[PDB]
Amino acid sequence: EWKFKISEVASDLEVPWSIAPLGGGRYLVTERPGRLVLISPSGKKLVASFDVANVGEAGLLGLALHPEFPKKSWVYLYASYFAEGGHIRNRVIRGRLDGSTFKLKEVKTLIDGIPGAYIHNGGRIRFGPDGMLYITTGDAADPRLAQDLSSLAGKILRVDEEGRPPADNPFPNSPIWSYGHRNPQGIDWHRASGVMVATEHGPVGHDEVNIILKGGNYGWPLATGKAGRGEFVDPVIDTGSETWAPSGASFVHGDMFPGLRGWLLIACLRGSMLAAVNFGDNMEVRKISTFFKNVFGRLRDVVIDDDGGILISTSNRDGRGSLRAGDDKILKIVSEQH
């Protein structure tokens, strides 16, 4: 039996979408309505507010710190906005975080005009082992766009710290890394192999975990789940008629849980649970385990803390859940001897 203790790191957040551990019990968190907050043992501090398109699944979403933070004080955000005509689009912006008096300055847009909608905005951003920023985007309720290489919808993007496509991106002067995605909201890299993984919401069922290759076509909307065709890269997990609704995903690492090292943790929304996936040698799926089914409600992000603790966000205030007292929360999972 897995043995642990769970505390509440923060409470009454409104749809905490993304969590970036700062170290020493400090955390940066986006709330989907349009606020970047600093969580400390001391308390809760508003860093920045944004005028976002806070409608359906759109709003203030992904958050990533520069690999060189706080030395390079750059913070990246993914946010929905109302464009010309009232249409929802998505952008990646960047500011500099003031080391004292935590406030955000010199905010600029890096990437603009990603398609958006009430549904399927993607929105998870994270730096990989290569130092590049990766960005997930959904099909914006327009599935054909996922196969279309001139469209930024239904993709995983890869840009530098400035939002530029590297010369070795798979397509000509294009931020696209992979394509054929429906609504990916979870990415991480295996800490030992550097193999990249992504989660995705499927059509009702057929939620996916994919191993992401450079230039790979993940099939949507021509294929869903394990299709067995040469032209499309199949998922390593396909939930079939079952709905997990996976979002954030992190590989376990650090001191706290040595038995979980190299397992993939996945926060599930409608599934209301923490899935754990054990990968063998050559990234084969050894085991899948399921935790906290319906005890916290909807879960959105999973990140590892500086010490190796498991941080999880609840998402019962997103229009789709039933509230517990003090929702939404950031929970920390530590070892029983902690």
Ligand X SMILES: OC[C@H]1O[C@H](O[C@H]2O[C@H](CO)[C@@H](O)[C@H](O)[C@H]2O)[C@H](O)[C@@H](O)[C@@H]1O
Annotated binding site: 182-183, 185, 201, 208, 218, 270, 298, 300, 320
Separation CA 97–CA 107 (nearest Å) = 10
CB of 196 closer than 8 Å to CB of 169: no
Q: Which does 72 bind (CB under 5 to 8 A by kind): ligand X, Ca ion, none?
A: none
DSSP conformation class of 216: -
Q: Which does 218 bind (CB under 5 to 8 A by kind): Ca ion, ligand X, none?
A: Ca ion
Q: Is 176 exposed, middle or buried (0-12, 13-18, 19+ CB in 10 A)?
A: buried
Residue 218: name the closest of 321, 109, 136, 308 by CA.
136
CB of 169 to ligand X, least distance (A): 20
Binding span for ligand X by CB under 6 A among 66-74, 161-169, 229-237, 255-263: 229-237
CA–CA separation, 33 and 29 (whole Å) = 12
**Which of ligand X, Ca ion, none does 148 bind, CB closer than 5 to 8 A by kind?**
ligand X
- Give the integer Cα–Cα distance in Å for 143 and 141: 6
Q: Which is nearer to Ca ion, 218 or 296 (CB)?
A: 218
Q: Which two tokens stand for residue 282?
A: 């050559």
Q: Which is nearer to Ca ion, 208 or 301 (CB)?
A: 208
Least CB distance to ligand X at residue 147 (A): 6
Phi, psi torsion values for 327, nearest 5 degrees = -60, 145
Burial of 69 (0-12, 13-18, 19+ CB in 10 A): middle
Based on the shown chain and the rule CB under 6 A, indicate whether residue 233 belongs to the binding site for ligand X.
Answer: yes
Is residue 138 close enough to count as binding Ca ion by CB under 5 A?
no
Question: Does 218 engage in binding with Ca ion (CB under 5 A)?
Answer: yes
Query: Percentages helix, strand, coil for the chain, rounded to the nearest 5?
Result: 5, 45, 55
Q: Nearer Cβ to ligand X, position 144 or 286?
A: 144
Which residues belong to the annotated binding site for Ca(2+)? Answer: 208, 218
- Return the number of the residue (14 or 208) whose C-beta is nearest ligand X: 208
The site partner of 219 among ligand X, Ca ion, none (C-beta below 5 to 8 Å per kind) is: Ca ion
Query: What is the 8-class DSSP label of residue 260?
Result: G
Q: Which residues pair with 81 in a beta bridge?
A: 89
Counting contacts by CB under 6 A, is residue 230 touching ligand X?
A: yes
Site for ligand X contains 86 (CB under 6 A): no
CB atoms within 10 A of CB 221: 16
Confirm or reject binding of residue 234 to ligand X (CB under 6 A). yes
Q: What is the spatial distance between Cα 75 and Cα 127, in angstroms, rounded to a whole number?
A: 11
* 41 contact, one of Ca ion, ligand X, none, CB 5-8 Å limit per kind: none
152 contacts ligand X (rule: CB under 6 A): no
Binding site for ligand X (CB under 6 A): 144, 147-148, 228-230, 232-234
Residues forming the site for Ca ion (CB under 5 A): 218-219
